[PDB]
Design a protein around this motif. Structure first.
Motif, PDB file in Angstrom:
ATOM      1  N   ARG B  24      68.932  56.773 -12.723  1.00 19.20           N
ATOM      2  CA  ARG B  24      67.949  55.743 -12.403  1.00 19.20           C
ATOM      3  C   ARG B  24      68.599  54.367 -12.421  1.00 19.20           C
ATOM      4  O   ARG B  24      68.278  53.504 -11.599  1.00 19.20           O
ATOM      5  CB  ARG B  24      66.770  55.802 -13.380  1.00 19.20           C
ATOM      6  N   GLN B  25      69.508  54.136 -13.367  1.00 20.72           N
ATOM      7  CA  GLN B  25      70.291  52.906 -13.336  1.00 20.72           C
ATOM      8  C   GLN B  25      71.184  52.860 -12.105  1.00 20.72           C
ATOM      9  O   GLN B  25      71.377  51.799 -11.502  1.00 20.72           O
ATOM     10  CB  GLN B  25      71.142  52.772 -14.595  1.00 20.72           C
ATOM     11  N   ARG B  27      70.694  54.220  -9.128  1.00 20.05           N
ATOM     12  CA  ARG B  27      69.852  53.782  -8.024  1.00 20.05           C
ATOM     13  C   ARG B  27      69.390  52.346  -8.222  1.00 20.05           C
ATOM     14  O   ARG B  27      69.098  51.644  -7.248  1.00 20.05           O
ATOM     15  CB  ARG B  27      68.662  54.726  -7.867  1.00 20.05           C
ATOM     16  N   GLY B  28      69.313  51.895  -9.475  1.00 22.82           N
ATOM     17  CA  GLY B  28      68.955  50.509  -9.736  1.00 22.82           C
ATOM     18  C   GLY B  28      69.986  49.525  -9.217  1.00 22.82           C
ATOM     19  O   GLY B  28      69.642  48.525  -8.582  1.00 22.82           O
ATOM     20  N   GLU B  31      70.417  49.550  -5.029  1.00 23.86           N
ATOM     21  CA  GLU B  31      69.640  48.514  -4.360  1.00 23.86           C
ATOM     22  C   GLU B  31      70.160  47.124  -4.706  1.00 23.86           C
ATOM     23  O   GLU B  31      70.284  46.264  -3.828  1.00 23.86           O
ATOM     24  CB  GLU B  31      68.162  48.640  -4.730  1.00 23.86           C
ATOM     25  N   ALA B  32      70.474  46.890  -5.983  1.00 22.78           N
ATOM     26  CA  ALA B  32      70.937  45.573  -6.412  1.00 22.78           C
ATOM     27  C   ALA B  32      72.263  45.212  -5.751  1.00 22.78           C
ATOM     28  O   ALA B  32      72.440  44.091  -5.260  1.00 22.78           O
ATOM     29  CB  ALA B  32      71.063  45.530  -7.934  1.00 22.78           C
TER      30      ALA B  32
END
Lengths: 62, 62
Positions: B24-25, B27-28, B31-32
């Protein structure tokens, strides 16, 4: 009066050039401002997204 | 063994979810990293786009 015609035609040829260049600046200034607004909304998306990921790692921290 | 199994079950459940947290990080940042990469390419090109407009605007007036 003929020297005036040379002077009047000189400024008139410059004034029509002034009209062309001013509108071109007007054309680009608007497009720059619309693309500026594209940048203004650009950070607003990720600013919402940088701090949502800033908060999503808080749960993954503790 | 059962008492450590509760620790084992807790540590297994939290780490198998922590791997979910890790991805999840991932994928965090995905995008970032993309959005920052999307901005910096857009930021630099649009600034010089404005300079291009700014140069011609300066050229027409100077």
């Amino acid at each position: 009066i003929d020297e005036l015609t040379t002077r009047k035609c000189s400024v008139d040829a410059r004034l029509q050039a002034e009209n062309e260049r001013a509108e071109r600046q007007d054309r680009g200034l608007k497009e720059a401002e619309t693309t500026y607004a594209k940048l203004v909304e650009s950070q607003k998306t990720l600013v919402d997204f940088v701090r949502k990921e800033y908060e999503d790692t808080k749960h993954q921290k503790y």
